[PDB]
Design a protein around this ligand. Structure first.
Ligand SMILES: OC[C@H]1O[C@H](O[C@H]2[C@H](O)[C@@H](O)[C@@H](O[C@H]3[C@H](O)[C@@H](O)[C@@H](O)O[C@@H]3CO)O[C@@H]2CO)[C@H](O)[C@@H](O)[C@@H]1O
Ligand SMILES: [Pt+2]
Ligand SMILES: [Pt+2]
Ligand SMILES: [Pt+2]
Ligand SMILES: [Pt+2]
Ligand SMILES: [Pt+2]
Length: 383
Protein backbone atom coordinates (compact mmCIF):
# COMPACT_ATOMS: atom_id res chain seq x y z
CA UNK A 1 0.00 0.00 0.00
CA UNK A 2 1.20 3.52 -0.87
CA UNK A 3 -0.05 6.42 1.25
CA UNK A 4 0.41 10.18 0.96
CA UNK A 5 1.29 13.04 3.30
CA UNK A 6 0.80 16.66 2.19
CA UNK A 7 2.66 19.11 4.43
CA UNK A 8 3.97 22.68 4.56
CA UNK A 9 7.40 21.94 6.10
CA UNK A 10 10.30 24.29 5.38
CA UNK A 11 13.54 22.91 3.89
CA UNK A 12 15.29 21.98 7.15
CA UNK A 13 12.18 20.33 8.59
CA UNK A 14 11.31 18.38 5.45
CA UNK A 15 14.89 17.08 5.37
CA UNK A 16 14.17 15.57 8.78
CA UNK A 17 10.81 14.26 7.56
CA UNK A 18 12.57 12.49 4.69
CA UNK A 19 14.96 10.78 7.12
CA UNK A 20 12.04 9.72 9.33
CA UNK A 21 10.03 8.45 6.35
CA UNK A 22 13.02 6.45 5.12
CA UNK A 23 13.24 4.71 8.50
CA UNK A 24 9.47 4.12 8.54
CA UNK A 25 9.55 2.37 5.16
CA UNK A 26 12.50 0.23 6.28
CA UNK A 27 10.59 -0.86 9.40
CA UNK A 28 7.23 -1.32 7.62
CA UNK A 29 7.60 -3.56 4.56
CA UNK A 30 4.46 -3.22 2.50
CA UNK A 31 3.98 0.50 3.20
CA UNK A 32 5.56 3.29 1.18
CA UNK A 33 4.91 7.02 1.57
CA UNK A 34 4.69 9.84 -0.97
CA UNK A 35 5.31 13.26 0.59
CA UNK A 36 4.27 16.50 -1.10
CA UNK A 37 5.21 20.02 0.00
CA UNK A 38 2.73 22.85 -0.40
CA UNK A 39 3.10 26.32 1.08
CA UNK A 40 0.77 26.86 4.05
CA UNK A 41 -1.99 28.75 2.19
CA UNK A 42 -1.96 26.41 -0.82
CA UNK A 43 -1.85 23.35 1.45
CA UNK A 44 -5.10 24.46 3.10
CA UNK A 45 -6.91 25.26 -0.13
CA UNK A 46 -5.63 22.23 -2.08
CA UNK A 47 -6.46 19.79 0.73
CA UNK A 48 -9.95 21.27 1.00
CA UNK A 49 -10.49 21.01 -2.77
CA UNK A 50 -9.09 17.48 -3.05
CA UNK A 51 -10.99 16.12 -0.05
CA UNK A 52 -14.28 17.72 -1.09
CA UNK A 53 -13.74 16.11 -4.50
CA UNK A 54 -13.56 12.73 -2.78
CA UNK A 55 -9.78 12.31 -2.68
CA UNK A 56 -6.72 13.89 -1.10
CA UNK A 57 -3.84 12.49 0.94
CA UNK A 58 -4.29 10.15 3.89
CA UNK A 59 -2.33 12.55 6.12
CA UNK A 60 -2.18 16.36 6.04
CA UNK A 61 0.21 18.41 8.20
CA UNK A 62 -0.01 22.11 9.00
CA UNK A 63 -0.79 24.84 11.52
CA UNK A 64 -3.40 24.18 14.16
CA UNK A 65 -5.89 26.78 12.92
CA UNK A 66 -6.64 24.59 9.94
CA UNK A 67 -8.63 22.37 12.36
CA UNK A 68 -11.70 24.63 12.28
CA UNK A 69 -12.21 24.68 8.52
CA UNK A 70 -11.18 21.05 8.03
CA UNK A 71 -13.44 19.77 10.81
CA UNK A 72 -16.49 21.86 9.93
CA UNK A 73 -16.24 20.71 6.28
CA UNK A 74 -16.17 17.09 7.50
CA UNK A 75 -12.92 16.30 5.68
CA UNK A 76 -10.79 15.11 8.63
CA UNK A 77 -11.45 12.37 11.20
CA UNK A 78 -11.76 12.88 14.98
CA UNK A 79 -8.67 11.25 16.49
CA UNK A 80 -10.07 10.51 19.96
CA UNK A 81 -11.33 7.04 19.03
CA UNK A 82 -8.38 6.43 16.68
CA UNK A 83 -5.61 7.07 19.23
CA UNK A 84 -7.43 6.84 22.59
CA UNK A 85 -7.79 9.37 25.39
CA UNK A 86 -4.68 8.22 27.27
CA UNK A 87 -2.77 9.17 24.11
CA UNK A 88 -3.50 12.90 24.28
CA UNK A 89 -2.64 13.35 27.97
CA UNK A 90 0.99 12.54 27.07
CA UNK A 91 1.31 15.74 25.02
CA UNK A 92 1.29 19.46 25.70
CA UNK A 93 -2.36 20.53 25.10
CA UNK A 94 -1.07 23.20 22.69
CA UNK A 95 -0.11 20.35 20.37
CA UNK A 96 -3.67 18.93 20.37
CA UNK A 97 -6.09 21.87 20.32
CA UNK A 98 -9.71 20.89 20.95
CA UNK A 99 -12.48 21.97 18.60
CA UNK A 100 -16.16 21.05 19.00
CA UNK A 101 -15.12 18.82 21.89
CA UNK A 102 -12.84 16.61 19.76
CA UNK A 103 -9.19 16.27 18.77
CA UNK A 104 -8.64 16.65 15.03
CA UNK A 105 -4.86 17.20 15.04
CA UNK A 106 -1.75 16.00 16.87
CA UNK A 107 1.43 18.02 16.54
CA UNK A 108 5.01 16.82 16.89
CA UNK A 109 6.28 20.07 18.44
CA UNK A 110 5.04 23.15 20.26
CA UNK A 111 5.85 26.69 19.20
CA UNK A 112 5.06 28.17 15.79
CA UNK A 113 5.76 31.53 17.45
CA UNK A 114 7.35 34.68 16.04
CA UNK A 115 10.29 36.39 17.71
CA UNK A 116 13.12 38.82 17.04
CA UNK A 117 16.25 37.22 15.61
CA UNK A 118 19.48 39.17 15.43
CA UNK A 119 22.80 38.54 13.68
CA UNK A 120 25.60 38.61 16.26
CA UNK A 121 27.98 39.88 13.57
CA UNK A 122 26.17 43.20 14.11
CA UNK A 123 24.25 43.05 17.41
CA UNK A 124 25.25 41.63 20.80
CA UNK A 125 22.45 43.11 22.94
CA UNK A 126 18.99 43.08 21.33
CA UNK A 127 16.60 46.03 21.67
CA UNK A 128 14.05 45.63 24.46
CA UNK A 129 11.51 48.19 23.21
CA UNK A 130 10.35 49.76 19.97
CA UNK A 131 12.22 53.03 20.48
CA UNK A 132 15.46 51.05 20.85
CA UNK A 133 14.46 48.89 17.88
CA UNK A 134 14.07 51.93 15.65
CA UNK A 135 17.25 53.67 16.83
CA UNK A 136 19.32 50.52 16.30
CA UNK A 137 17.49 49.76 13.06
CA UNK A 138 18.43 53.17 11.66
CA UNK A 139 22.09 52.68 12.56
CA UNK A 140 22.02 49.20 10.96
CA UNK A 141 20.47 50.45 7.67
CA UNK A 142 23.39 51.43 5.45
CA UNK A 143 23.93 52.62 1.87
CA UNK A 144 27.64 52.05 1.26
CA UNK A 145 27.83 53.89 -2.08
CA UNK A 146 25.43 56.70 -1.14
CA UNK A 147 23.37 55.80 -4.21
CA UNK A 148 19.97 55.34 -2.55
CA UNK A 149 20.30 51.58 -2.92
CA UNK A 150 20.37 50.02 0.55
CA UNK A 151 23.04 47.36 1.11
CA UNK A 152 22.07 46.26 4.63
CA UNK A 153 18.72 46.62 6.37
CA UNK A 154 18.15 47.21 10.05
CA UNK A 155 15.10 44.94 10.12
CA UNK A 156 13.39 42.54 7.71
CA UNK A 157 10.23 40.48 7.96
CA UNK A 158 7.24 39.32 5.93
CA UNK A 159 5.24 42.28 7.17
CA UNK A 160 2.48 42.01 4.53
CA UNK A 161 1.42 38.62 5.91
CA UNK A 162 -1.15 38.94 8.73
CA UNK A 163 0.55 36.36 10.97
CA UNK A 164 3.57 38.67 11.08
CA UNK A 165 1.73 41.81 12.21
CA UNK A 166 -0.74 39.96 14.48
CA UNK A 167 1.57 40.13 17.56
CA UNK A 168 1.40 43.94 17.56
CA UNK A 169 -2.39 44.16 17.63
CA UNK A 170 -2.86 43.37 21.37
CA UNK A 171 0.16 45.52 22.25
CA UNK A 172 -1.79 48.48 20.84
CA UNK A 173 -5.04 47.48 22.55
CA UNK A 174 -7.71 44.89 21.86
CA UNK A 175 -7.08 41.35 20.64
CA UNK A 176 -8.24 40.65 17.09
CA UNK A 177 -10.78 38.04 18.24
CA UNK A 178 -13.26 38.64 21.04
CA UNK A 179 -13.35 36.44 24.13
CA UNK A 180 -15.97 34.13 22.61
CA UNK A 181 -13.32 33.02 20.11
CA UNK A 182 -15.62 33.58 17.12
CA UNK A 183 -16.43 37.31 16.80
CA UNK A 184 -13.87 39.36 14.84
CA UNK A 185 -12.61 42.46 16.65
CA UNK A 186 -10.87 44.32 13.83
CA UNK A 187 -12.53 47.77 13.73
CA UNK A 188 -10.30 48.91 16.56
CA UNK A 189 -7.74 51.56 17.36
CA UNK A 190 -5.34 48.67 17.98
CA UNK A 191 -5.52 47.42 14.39
CA UNK A 192 -5.32 50.96 12.97
CA UNK A 193 -2.27 51.61 15.17
CA UNK A 194 -0.67 48.33 14.04
CA UNK A 195 -1.18 49.31 10.40
CA UNK A 196 0.35 52.72 11.12
CA UNK A 197 3.28 51.32 13.12
CA UNK A 198 4.46 49.21 10.21
CA UNK A 199 3.88 52.04 7.73
CA UNK A 200 6.11 54.18 9.95
CA UNK A 201 8.86 51.53 9.98
CA UNK A 202 8.74 51.41 6.17
CA UNK A 203 8.20 55.04 5.18
CA UNK A 204 9.30 57.26 8.06
CA UNK A 205 12.04 55.44 9.96
CA UNK A 206 12.92 53.53 6.75
CA UNK A 207 14.45 50.56 8.57
CA UNK A 208 12.53 47.82 6.69
CA UNK A 209 12.51 47.36 2.88
CA UNK A 210 9.71 48.70 0.71
CA UNK A 211 9.26 45.17 -0.71
CA UNK A 212 9.95 42.24 1.58
CA UNK A 213 8.25 38.88 1.13
CA UNK A 214 9.17 35.83 3.20
CA UNK A 215 12.00 34.63 0.98
CA UNK A 216 13.47 38.13 0.66
CA UNK A 217 13.69 38.56 4.44
CA UNK A 218 15.02 35.01 4.75
CA UNK A 219 17.75 35.56 2.15
CA UNK A 220 18.75 38.98 3.49
CA UNK A 221 19.25 37.55 6.99
CA UNK A 222 21.22 34.54 5.72
CA UNK A 223 23.40 36.82 3.56
CA UNK A 224 24.42 39.19 6.41
CA UNK A 225 22.30 41.94 4.84
CA UNK A 226 19.78 42.30 7.71
CA UNK A 227 20.81 42.93 11.32
CA UNK A 228 17.40 41.91 12.69
CA UNK A 229 14.60 39.62 11.53
CA UNK A 230 11.13 38.69 12.73
CA UNK A 231 10.49 35.01 12.04
CA UNK A 232 9.26 31.84 13.69
CA UNK A 233 10.88 28.87 15.39
CA UNK A 234 10.49 26.87 12.15
CA UNK A 235 13.39 28.94 10.77
CA UNK A 236 16.04 28.15 13.40
CA UNK A 237 17.35 25.03 11.69
CA UNK A 238 17.88 26.72 8.35
CA UNK A 239 19.75 29.68 9.86
CA UNK A 240 21.98 27.23 11.76
CA UNK A 241 22.71 25.34 8.54
CA UNK A 242 23.45 28.67 6.83
CA UNK A 243 26.00 29.38 9.61
CA UNK A 244 24.25 32.52 10.86
CA UNK A 245 25.37 33.23 14.44
CA UNK A 246 22.00 34.48 15.66
CA UNK A 247 20.35 35.25 18.96
CA UNK A 248 16.63 35.38 19.70
CA UNK A 249 14.51 37.73 21.80
CA UNK A 250 10.97 38.92 22.35
CA UNK A 251 9.60 41.18 19.64
CA UNK A 252 10.37 44.45 21.47
CA UNK A 253 7.82 46.05 23.78
CA UNK A 254 5.92 48.95 22.23
CA UNK A 255 7.34 52.03 23.95
CA UNK A 256 4.08 54.01 23.76
CA UNK A 257 1.97 51.31 25.45
CA UNK A 258 4.33 49.33 27.67
CA UNK A 259 3.01 46.10 26.14
CA UNK A 260 4.91 43.20 24.65
CA UNK A 261 3.71 42.13 21.20
CA UNK A 262 2.06 38.78 21.74
CA UNK A 263 3.08 35.95 19.37
CA UNK A 264 0.51 33.29 18.58
CA UNK A 265 1.68 30.04 20.19
CA UNK A 266 0.51 26.67 18.98
CA UNK A 267 1.54 23.71 16.85
CA UNK A 268 1.71 22.23 13.40
CA UNK A 269 0.34 18.73 13.33
CA UNK A 270 -1.20 15.76 11.56
CA UNK A 271 -4.83 15.10 10.64
CA UNK A 272 -6.37 11.99 9.03
CA UNK A 273 -8.47 12.33 5.86
CA UNK A 274 -12.10 11.36 6.23
CA UNK A 275 -11.62 9.81 2.74
CA UNK A 276 -9.64 6.55 2.80
CA UNK A 277 -9.33 4.36 -0.29
CA UNK A 278 -9.41 1.11 1.69
CA UNK A 279 -8.95 -0.44 5.11
CA UNK A 280 -5.28 -1.10 4.33
CA UNK A 281 -4.70 2.58 3.50
CA UNK A 282 -6.37 3.62 6.77
CA UNK A 283 -4.37 1.19 8.92
CA UNK A 284 -1.15 2.30 7.22
CA UNK A 285 -2.01 5.97 7.76
CA UNK A 286 -2.64 5.38 11.46
CA UNK A 287 0.70 3.56 11.79
CA UNK A 288 2.47 6.46 10.10
CA UNK A 289 0.66 9.03 12.27
CA UNK A 290 1.72 7.22 15.44
CA UNK A 291 5.31 6.94 14.17
CA UNK A 292 5.65 10.59 13.13
CA UNK A 293 4.44 11.73 16.56
CA UNK A 294 6.54 9.15 18.45
CA UNK A 295 9.26 10.38 20.77
CA UNK A 296 12.17 9.11 18.59
CA UNK A 297 10.88 11.23 15.69
CA UNK A 298 10.11 14.25 17.90
CA UNK A 299 13.65 14.12 19.27
CA UNK A 300 15.08 13.84 15.76
CA UNK A 301 13.43 17.18 14.97
CA UNK A 302 14.49 18.54 18.36
CA UNK A 303 18.10 17.55 17.63
CA UNK A 304 18.35 18.70 14.02
CA UNK A 305 16.13 21.83 13.88
CA UNK A 306 15.98 22.75 17.54
CA UNK A 307 12.23 22.87 18.26
CA UNK A 308 10.38 21.87 21.45
CA UNK A 309 8.74 18.40 21.44
CA UNK A 310 5.03 18.13 22.09
CA UNK A 311 5.49 14.92 24.10
CA UNK A 312 6.00 15.85 27.75
CA UNK A 313 8.41 13.06 28.69
CA UNK A 314 10.49 13.71 25.55
CA UNK A 315 11.33 17.14 27.00
CA UNK A 316 13.46 15.42 29.66
CA UNK A 317 15.98 14.46 26.95
CA UNK A 318 19.45 16.00 26.95
CA UNK A 319 18.63 17.04 23.38
CA UNK A 320 16.00 19.41 24.77
CA UNK A 321 17.69 20.41 28.03
CA UNK A 322 20.98 21.31 26.31
CA UNK A 323 19.45 23.42 23.53
CA UNK A 324 20.53 26.99 24.34
CA UNK A 325 17.52 28.53 22.57
CA UNK A 326 14.76 26.84 24.50
CA UNK A 327 14.99 28.87 27.73
CA UNK A 328 14.68 32.22 25.92
CA UNK A 329 12.09 30.65 23.63
CA UNK A 330 10.02 29.79 26.71
CA UNK A 331 10.34 33.41 27.87
CA UNK A 332 9.12 34.52 24.42
CA UNK A 333 6.12 32.18 24.54
CA UNK A 334 5.31 33.40 28.07
CA UNK A 335 3.81 36.61 26.68
CA UNK A 336 2.14 34.84 23.75
CA UNK A 337 -1.46 33.78 23.36
CA UNK A 338 -2.76 30.44 22.07
CA UNK A 339 -3.47 30.08 18.37
CA UNK A 340 -7.26 30.16 17.84
CA UNK A 341 -8.59 27.33 15.67
CA UNK A 342 -12.28 28.08 15.08
CA UNK A 343 -13.26 28.49 11.40
CA UNK A 344 -14.04 32.17 12.03
CA UNK A 345 -10.27 32.77 12.32
CA UNK A 346 -9.92 31.92 8.62
CA UNK A 347 -12.21 34.83 7.73
CA UNK A 348 -10.13 37.10 9.98
CA UNK A 349 -6.85 36.13 8.31
CA UNK A 350 -8.26 36.49 4.79
CA UNK A 351 -9.87 39.88 5.50
CA UNK A 352 -6.74 41.22 7.21
CA UNK A 353 -4.56 40.21 4.27
CA UNK A 354 -6.82 41.88 1.70
CA UNK A 355 -7.12 45.14 3.63
CA UNK A 356 -3.46 45.55 4.62
CA UNK A 357 -2.35 44.83 1.06
CA UNK A 358 -4.40 47.85 0.01
CA UNK A 359 -2.90 49.97 2.79
CA UNK A 360 0.65 49.01 1.86
CA UNK A 361 -0.14 49.61 -1.82
CA UNK A 362 -1.26 53.13 -0.88
CA UNK A 363 -4.94 53.07 -1.81
CA UNK A 364 -6.61 52.76 1.62
CA UNK A 365 -6.00 54.72 4.83
CA UNK A 366 -5.37 52.61 7.98
CA UNK A 367 -8.61 53.56 9.76
CA UNK A 368 -10.75 52.76 6.70
CA UNK A 369 -8.88 49.46 6.29
CA UNK A 370 -9.63 48.39 9.88
CA UNK A 371 -13.30 49.24 9.36
CA UNK A 372 -13.46 47.24 6.13
CA UNK A 373 -11.48 44.36 7.65
CA UNK A 374 -14.30 43.96 10.19
CA UNK A 375 -17.07 44.26 7.59
CA UNK A 376 -15.43 41.80 5.19
CA UNK A 377 -14.67 39.27 7.95
CA UNK A 378 -18.27 39.35 9.15
CA UNK A 379 -19.51 38.89 5.59
CA UNK A 380 -17.18 35.92 5.00
CA UNK A 381 -18.42 34.34 8.25
CA UNK A 382 -22.03 34.93 7.19
CA UNK A 383 -21.20 33.22 3.90
O1 LIG B 1 -0.83 35.17 7.71
C1 LIG B 1 -2.01 34.36 7.94
C2 LIG B 1 -1.66 32.89 8.14
O2 LIG B 1 -1.07 32.79 9.45
C3 LIG B 1 -0.70 31.47 9.86
O3 LIG B 1 0.24 30.93 8.94
C4 LIG B 1 1.56 30.89 9.44
C5 LIG B 1 1.89 29.47 9.91
O4 LIG B 1 1.06 29.13 11.04
C6 LIG B 1 3.34 29.44 10.34
O5 LIG B 1 3.75 28.09 10.64
C7 LIG B 1 4.29 29.98 9.28
O6 LIG B 1 4.37 29.11 8.17
C8 LIG B 1 5.75 28.76 7.92
C9 LIG B 1 5.86 27.24 7.94
O7 LIG B 1 5.56 26.70 9.24
C10 LIG B 1 7.25 26.78 7.53
O8 LIG B 1 7.20 25.36 7.38
C11 LIG B 1 7.69 27.44 6.22
O9 LIG B 1 6.90 26.94 5.15
O10 LIG B 1 7.56 28.87 6.29
C12 LIG B 1 6.23 29.32 6.57
C13 LIG B 1 6.26 30.84 6.58
O11 LIG B 1 6.56 31.34 5.27
O12 LIG B 1 3.85 31.26 8.84
C14 LIG B 1 2.52 31.28 8.32
C15 LIG B 1 2.23 32.69 7.81
O13 LIG B 1 2.89 32.90 6.54
C16 LIG B 1 -1.94 30.58 9.89
O14 LIG B 1 -1.61 29.24 10.28
C17 LIG B 1 -2.60 30.60 8.50
O15 LIG B 1 -3.83 29.84 8.53
C18 LIG B 1 -2.93 32.03 8.10
O16 LIG B 1 -3.46 32.02 6.76
PT1 LIG C 1 -14.22 28.92 5.84
PT1 LIG D 1 -15.81 22.33 1.98
PT1 LIG E 1 9.85 48.26 27.95
PT1 LIG F 1 0.47 30.41 26.97
PT1 LIG G 1 -15.82 29.16 7.60
Amino acid sequence: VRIQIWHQMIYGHRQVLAEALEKFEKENPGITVQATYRETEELRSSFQSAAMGGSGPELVYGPSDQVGPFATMGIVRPLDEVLGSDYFQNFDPLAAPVYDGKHYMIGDAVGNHLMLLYNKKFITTPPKNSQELIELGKKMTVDTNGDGKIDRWGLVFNYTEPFFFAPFIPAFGEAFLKADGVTPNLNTTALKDTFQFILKLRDQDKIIPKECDYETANALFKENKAAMLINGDWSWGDYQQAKVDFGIARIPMISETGKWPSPLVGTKGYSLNANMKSEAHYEAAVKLLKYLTSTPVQLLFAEKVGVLPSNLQARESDIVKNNPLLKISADIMEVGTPMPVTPEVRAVWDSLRIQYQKVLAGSLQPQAAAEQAQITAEQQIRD
